[PDB]
């Protein structure tokens, strides 16, 4: 009924996207104040990442080995340092388009917009969720290494994600902006298959609340008894903090969260019944409770 996924307006991030080249490797960087952030494997050929000692590899690089292009302007690199798996290139020019920003680390199930870029050039914006197995699926990040994910709240940009690599299955892995990987992945040429992906329970309940707000109303009182049922259909556990988050939606629809959980209980058992929920026949799990109140 017109309930749509929203991407954040990407202009504040577009103004920060640059191209970083080191040898034969070119990828996207993020220019904030006088620092450019990018994956540390920018210093590596693919053969370098067979058995990389990144501290030793970085010792062999100088500032002049880093070529930073911001549109038509080359930015001179005047310092470099590793923070976890992110490289920080100090440049001689502070970005005059730097927005208010902060670096945050998010949790599976939380959503964010990704600005896919090709070699510093913005291509498209996608609203994504952090899957429980910490991967992002889709071809839009192919050839978009170093693109970032973000939320915007009152024109403050919370950067939460930087893309590092596509796995042989086609799913993607990355870090936060402090350079710590989401999930058990490594910037090394080695097998590292993603774990089993599960369904984000708290988001499905938010979507059911969105389904009640737009008039779809055909629908385990205790939290613990519901979790006993949810853990059997490959759904994530519902914490007491989750029920707190669903409070706002619960007050608006007047529907108790545990009552909504009771409704989710039997949807997983019976089936589709050939009917639709918000123009969908499957349960949707990529809208957070915040995303729903944001729209409704």
């Amino acid at each position, epitope marked *: 009924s017109g309930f749509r996924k929203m991407a954040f307006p990407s202009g504040k991030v577009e103004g920060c996207m640059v191209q970083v080249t080191c040898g034969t490797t070119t990828l996207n960087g993020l220019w904030l104040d006088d620092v450019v952030y990018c994956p540390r494997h920018v210093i590596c050929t693919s*053969e370098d990442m067979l058995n990389p000692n990144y501290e030793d590899l970085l010792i062999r690089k100088s500032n002049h080995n880093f070529l930073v292009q911001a549109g038509n302007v080359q930015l001179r690199v005047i310092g470099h340092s590793m923070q976890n798996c992110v490289l920080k290139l100090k440049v001689d020019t502070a970005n005059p388009k730097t927005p208010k920003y902060k670096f945050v680390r998010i949790q599976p199930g939380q959503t964010f917009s990704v600005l896919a870029c090709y070699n510093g050039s913005p291509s498209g914006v996608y609203q994504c969720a952090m899957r429980p197995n910490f991967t992002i699926k889709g071809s839009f990040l192919n050839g978009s290494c170093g693109s970032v994910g973000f939320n915007i709240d009152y024109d403050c940009v919370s950067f939460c994600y930087m893309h590092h*690599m596509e*796995l042989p299955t*086609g799913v993607h892995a990355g870090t936060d902006l402090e350079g710590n990987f989401y999930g058990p992945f490594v910037d090394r040429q080695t*097998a590292q298959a993603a774990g089993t992906d599960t369904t984000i329970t708290v988001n499905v309940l938010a979507w059911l609340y969105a389904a009640v707000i737009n008039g779809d109303r055909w629908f385990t009182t205790t939290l613990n008894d519901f979790n006993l049922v949810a853990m059997k259909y490959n759904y994530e556990p519902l914490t007491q903090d989750h029920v707190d988050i669903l409070g706002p939606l619960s007050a608006q629809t007047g529907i108790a969260v545990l009552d909504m959980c009771a409704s989710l209980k039997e949807l997983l058992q019976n089936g589709m019944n050939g009917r639709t929920i918000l123009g969908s026949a499957l349960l949707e799990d990529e809208f957070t409770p915040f995303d729903v109140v944001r729209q409704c």
Partner: nanobody
Amino acid sequence: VQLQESGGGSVAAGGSLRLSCAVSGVTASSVYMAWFRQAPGKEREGLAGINTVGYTTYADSVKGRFTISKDNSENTLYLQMNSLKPEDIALYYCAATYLLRFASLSATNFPYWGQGTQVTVSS
């Protein structure tokens, strides 16, 4: 990772060849795999690639003529080469990778390479 190409040879224009790439040391189901060629004095050109769930990418230069396929039971990668032309003369290389950072068919993605098999086409 160990890659060995076979199946090259000499044909006349319009002819056909089937290249094979035998994978050793790892399972072919665990790596992104691709076929490249090195024409005389040219940089390596990515022709066809396949990820481990079957998604294929082809260069425009070989679309409609070359087909990449994979037999995990034999741990072998194949390139069916139809409608060959003198422009196709090169050593043809098998390649594999655990990690992509660039457009799929870019040689910069690949740390593992075979030694190449020769394809010649008379006009």
